Design a protein around this ligand. Structure first.
Ligand SMILES: Nc1ncnc2c1ncn2[C@@H]1O[C@H](COP(=O)(O)OP(=O)(O)NP(=O)(O)O)[C@@H](O)[C@H]1O
Ligand SMILES: [Mg+2]
Length: 295
């Protein structure tokens, strides 16, 4: 029925509202991800992600149990998993800071700012989480869906990677590519995936490299600016500017000429290495974290 992975949920009946349909209809939709108040706790807020059972469905439960035991400073812990005949519910803590996607989008609109030290802290957090998943957890965990929407910020402004591990939660490759086009996140899919249809650690490295590039450029891969550029993609445009006469032009003008230019150019080079067309040319998560910390 349901597996409890965190002491924050005292009783299982506290999640009974998840099996009430008309109670779910009233919940706020923050993502599908609902937002509710934990009944057992004294005002703790939880985010409940709803995934559809695959038509395959037996391995996702073992994968969820594996995810429920993973704990890292830069990984979003899974509090509980509720299993219904129609769908699965993954319970996380609600992070009022939001995701990196929301923060960067609001930074574009001028309703928010994000300094370079904070971005470097976020990048180091994502590197630590990716390295723990790739090279430290006893079974190697592949994210398969790394993007700024699956990286949240806690009250320490630390990165926390989410929505990882579930191999069976993913659709087929064609459906994944089409729905990532509609969602505007195809820029994080490595080139090799169009020929291999298989998720590897190097695909997560490519996604991380696109995120690293975003953190300096200040623009998303879905930006129409790249559709009005010669390279027609964020990665190729960045790759050309890094070796151009003036690489500093790739820096977000909000972060420019504030004493962090060389550091941002270094992480741009790191992202360039993380986004090479050949996966064997890309570095592993440990090397990425070491290079990010060498600044
Ligand atoms: N633990 C969480 N805490 C607070 N907000 C969250 C949390 N998880 C998700 N959200 C919000 O829900 C949005 C994304 O939810 P989600 O259903 O995962 O869509 P997605 O990431 O774009 N696609 P995918 O994860 O591949 O299915 C984010 O922008 C968050 O604002
Ligand atoms: Mg998500």
């Amino acid at each position: 029925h349901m597996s409890i992975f965190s002491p924050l949920i005292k009783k299982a009946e506290d999640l009974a509202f998840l099996e009430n349909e008309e109670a779910l209809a009233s919940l706020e939709i923050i993502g599908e991800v609902f937002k509710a108040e934990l009944p057992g706790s004294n005002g703790k807020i939880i985010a409940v992600k709803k995934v559809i059972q695959p038509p395959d469905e037996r391995q996702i439960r073992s994968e969820i149990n594996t995810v429920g035991h993973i704990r890292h400073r830069n990984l979003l812990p899974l509090l509980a998993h509720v299993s219904r005949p129609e769908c699965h519910y993954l319970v996380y803590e609600y992070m009022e800071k939001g995701s990196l996607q929301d923060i960067l989008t609001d930074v574009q609109a001028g309703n928010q700012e994000l300094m370079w030290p904070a971005r470097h802290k976020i990048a180091l957090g994502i590197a630590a989480g990716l390295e723990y998943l790739h090279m430290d957890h006893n079974p190697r965990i592949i994210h398969r869906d790394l993007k700024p929407a699956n990286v949240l910020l806690d009250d320490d402004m630390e990165a926390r990677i989410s929505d990882f591990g579930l191999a069976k939660a993913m659709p087929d490759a064609v459906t994944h590519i089409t729905t990532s086009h509609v969602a505007g996140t195809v820029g994080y899919i490595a080139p090799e995936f169009y020929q291999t249809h298989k998720f590897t650690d190097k695909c997560d490295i490519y996604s991380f490299g696109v995120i690293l590039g975003i953190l300096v450029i200040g623009k998303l891969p879905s930006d129409e600016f790249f559709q009005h550029t010669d390279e027609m993609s964020l990665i190729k445009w960045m790759r050309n500017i890094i070796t151009s006469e003036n690489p500093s032009l790739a820096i977000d003008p909000k972060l420019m000429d504030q004493g962090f230019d060389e550091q941002m150019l270094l992480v741009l080079k790191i992202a360039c290495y993380c986004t090479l067309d050949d996966p064997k040319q890309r570095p592993n998560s440990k090397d990425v974290r070491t290079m990010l910390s060498q600044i």
